[PDB]
RNA sequence: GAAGGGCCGCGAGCCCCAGCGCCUGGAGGAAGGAGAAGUCGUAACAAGGUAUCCGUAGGUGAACCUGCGGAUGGAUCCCU
């Protein structure tokens, strides 16, 4: 439903920052095996 | 040449004032400890039901609450 011949989506760009309570309350992130606490893989 | 006397040198005793201990009375006031099985709440330990804890300031019956900066001894060793 646009007119302009050739246009595209806009995007976005946001750095969310949060504490750790808000993180895992959120699960962000989660508590770990004391093992798997050494993995620092994204 | 004795008693007796005068002035000083030595130096008791007492008085009087100040220091210096040490012990002790006290209306009230305010702590600590034990016997306790007495009221009132539930601050902490689990995300203890508002993460906890340090410094500081103020406030509330009580534990405690709140603001400003900090720490992990956290409930996160992990992402243009
Ligand atoms: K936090
Ligand atoms: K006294
Ligand atoms: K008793
Ligand atoms: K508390
Ligand atoms: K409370
Ligand atoms: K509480
Ligand atoms: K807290
Ligand atoms: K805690
Ligand atoms: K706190
Ligand atoms: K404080
Ligand atoms: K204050
Ligand atoms: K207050
Ligand atoms: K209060
Ligand atoms: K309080
Ligand atoms: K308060
Ligand atoms: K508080
Ligand atoms: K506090
Ligand atoms: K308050
Ligand atoms: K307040
Ligand atoms: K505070
Ligand atoms: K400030
Ligand atoms: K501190
Ligand atoms: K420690
Ligand atoms: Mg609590
Ligand atoms: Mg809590």
Known sequence: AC???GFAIP???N???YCVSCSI???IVR???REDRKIRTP
């Open 3 to 5: 007119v302009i011949q």
């Open 11 to 13: 995007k976005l760009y």
């Open 15 to 17: 750095k969310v920052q």
């Open 25 to 27: 309350h959120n699960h």
């Open 31 to 33: 508590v770990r095996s």
